Amino acid sequence: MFDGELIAKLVVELNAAMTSAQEALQFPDFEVVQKAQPTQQGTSTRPTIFFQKLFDIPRGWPATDWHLDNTARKYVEITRQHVETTFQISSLHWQNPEITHVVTASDIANYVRAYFQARSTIERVKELDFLILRVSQISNEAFENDNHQFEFHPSFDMVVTYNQYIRLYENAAYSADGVLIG
Amino acid sequence: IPGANLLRMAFGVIGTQIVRYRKFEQRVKNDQAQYVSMFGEPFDLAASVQRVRRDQYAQFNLEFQRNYVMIFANFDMVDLDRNMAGDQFLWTGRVFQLESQGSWFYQDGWGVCLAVDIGAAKA
Known part of the structure; x- marks a missing residue:
């Protein structure tokens, strides 16, 4: 499944979480952005979510399983690996x-973390071909900020598990014979 | 001579700009243990504004260029003590951190650009 699909799905889910949290806590407005922008950018003065x-x-x-192509007389080897990735949400x-x-x-x-840990959201995201493990800590960090005003940057990390597929070719055999000696 | 101010007589040659200056009086609480301050009666002041011309940095993907200004004015202004600072705005609100030769005749200042002013002909 790799990255682009995973990132798009996670972006949609984060947007839904903010859509809920806005009525939950009455924010002015929100934005979801990714860290490490490939182009020079400036931050936004609104409640924001970052992920990486x-x-x-x-x-x-x-784990390898074999599928047979009759027309070309070939086995296509499919290998599946169950990967875990950690995303940092701040x-x-x-x-x-x-x-x-x-x-x-x-x-x-805290609200964003609580949203992803609910049973209903897990049930809904199961059809999107990945699941989430537990989250164990949220930390507050204080920095000086560009306007020389103290500010907080809370963050936590999240784990999603899925499957990666690769595809290869292999020859096929159709008969057997032997020799018996004594 | 450290008597008659040199800045006042120098302002008759170079030329200056006009800013609005408000001072600090006291501060109170907002049932969060956070100080909130109040300022009183902003007035017009004549000052010479210079540049220091900032460069940006990063924390992670967060560039955060901080805006800075240098101001010269014949006023006995204070940036910080057990109380608050002063404010100004050439076009956007600003606050400074330094001191100068106030008790003789003149001072010079600093500034960090806070976001914007309220509006209504630059209130």
């Missing part, structure tokens, strides 16, 4: 002290 891919785990020996939001209605960036991160 860290690494992969093969998770098990490869959010950004600036706190205006004057407003009385308060929503935190860590609040948005």
Whole structure:
């Protein structure tokens, strides 16, 4: 399944999660963007979600099954590997002290984490050919920010498991014979 | 001589720009242990604004270029103490971090560009 399909599906799911969270907590507006933009870009001054891919785990020996093509008299070898990938999810939001209605960036991160761990979302995403494991920690980190104003960048990582397929060719045999000696 | 200010008589040659300056009085809480401050009666001040001309960096995919300005003004302004700073805007709100020779005759300043001003003919 590789990357492009996975990234598109994850983007759609994150958009749905923000669509829910907006009515849940009454944000002004939101945006979902990927980290490591290939082109020079500037960040947006709105509640934002960032994601990135860290690494992969093969998770098990490869499994091969054989399919036969009768017309060309060939076996096509199909090998499946069940890979685990870790995505890092992080959010950004600036706190205006004057407003009385308060929503935190860590609040948005917590809601996004809770959305992906629900049973209904797992049942819905099962048809999209991947599943999610547990999430074990969310951390707040403070940085100076470009306007010399302290700000928080909460983040957590998420794991999705799927299957990768490769395809190859192999010869086929149609008969057997032997010799017996004593 | 460290008597009559040199900046005042220098302003009669080079030429300056006009900014709106507001000072800080006190601050209160907002039942979150976060200080929120209040300023009073912004007024017009004559000052010479210079450049330092920033360059950007990265944290990760986040470029975050910080905007900076250098300002010279014959005013006894303060950037930081156990209280707040002062504000200004040539076109957008700004705040500074430095000091200068205020108690004799003049000072010079700094500035970081906060996002925008409210509007309504640059309030």
